[model samples]
Target: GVHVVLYQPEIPANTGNIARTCAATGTELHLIRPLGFSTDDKMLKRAGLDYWQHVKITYYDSIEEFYEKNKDGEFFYLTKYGEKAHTAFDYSKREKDYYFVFGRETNGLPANVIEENFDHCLRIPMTDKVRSLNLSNTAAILIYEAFRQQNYPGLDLEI
Candidate 1:
């Protein structure tokens, strides 16, 4: 299974939309603290709807705490600075739990973090005209790609 990790996400709606995607995919959602909006924000609840309960979300007090707790998992950081394309790595061969970590909507992942995990960092191909894609959209794109590589294990194959 794959995990989606959001570090210091600032938008409630973006997180909410991502949460909905997790509900549909049966993927776990991890949120690092210093979030921009309250968890009870109306926009969040509206986007997630009744699906919120189905989403398995874990909260972390800090990025340090998040890392310490999931130290055994292989993490793939998504950043514009990533030297590799997101598809460069093979998710199907993963023997341990894999995590796709996305940064905040505005600044993105810290430079230090990217530098430390340069090889594990990956990016979605896009024109340079835009700095980056929408947070929720990027999350869905990366998550689905990993799922696609694994033949979407545990996911419904039929409508």
Candidate 2:
């Protein structure tokens, strides 16, 4: 399964929606704190609904903590500065486990974090004028790309 990691997310609703996406796609959600809102925030509950219960949500005190715990997995940071486009990464050929990370809504992950730890970085192409894509939307785009490359066949689902 794919892993979705959010670095210090700031919006409850976005996080909630991302959780729902992960649940549907069978991705594990790893949240690095200090999150802007509690998991029980009204907006979060509203967006996630009962699907939150099915989502595999994991919490880490910091990036270092997560790295220490998941040392064996490849960590990739999604950034505007990435040299490669996301689709070019060939997700189907990746090792069995990897972490796909996104930054916070307001400021994005710190510069040092990207420089120090991420094994690779990638970006979704966009017109030069736009500021950035929404966190949840970006997550959905990247996750689905990986899913498609894998032929959308390995996911666990109940009809």
Candidate 3:
């Protein structure tokens, strides 16, 4: 299954909703800090409802830490600056495990991060004047595309 990685996310509700999305879709959720809100925040619990407990979440101290831990997995940054459109590549065409990364709400991602990892970037097309979509929404869109290409296989269905 594809993993959803959020880099320095700031909103609890969005994180909670993305957690719930990951739960429902059987995707692993990775939260790379420094986060603006805590996992124990009431807003997260409130937004996620009872489903929060079902979500598979992993916390990373930083992107460097996450990269070190998940080096084996293919990393793809979902951004506006991606050279290739997301649909251009067939997700199921490769055998390697993959992770889809999204940036923070206020600022998309650090310039150094994008510049250092230019080859890893992929973008969803949009009209002019549209900066980007919501963090959770973008995650959902990209992840579901991955899932669909993979035939929605191997997700934990019991939860």
Pick by TM-score: which candidate is best?
Answer: 1
Looking at model 1, residue 49 earns an lDDT score of 72
Off by over 4 Å in 2: 41-48, 93-95, 117-119, 154-158
Cα distance off (Å), candidate 3, residue 134: 1.0
- What lDDT would each prediction earn against the true structure? 0.88, 0.83, 0.82
TM per candidate: 0.91, 0.89, 0.88
Cα displacement (angstroms), candidate 1, residue 74, comes to: 1.2
Q: How close is candidate 3 to the true structure, as a TM-score?
A: 0.88
For residues 1-159, write the lDDT of model 2, one tens digit per residue.
Answer: 688999999987788789989988888999999999888647555754778888888899998899888887667889887767878776785457767999988788789877874458787798999878899999999888888888775565566
Q: Tell me the lDDT of candidate 3.
A: 0.82
Expressed as tens digits, the lDDT of each residue in 1-159 for candidate 1 is: 689999999987898899999998988999998899787647556654778889989999998999998988779999888889988888885355889999999899999999899989998888979998899998999889888988887788586
Compute the lDDT for candidate 2: 0.83
Which order, best to worst by lDDT? 1, 2, 3
lDDT of 1 at 130: 92
lDDT of 3 at 5: 93
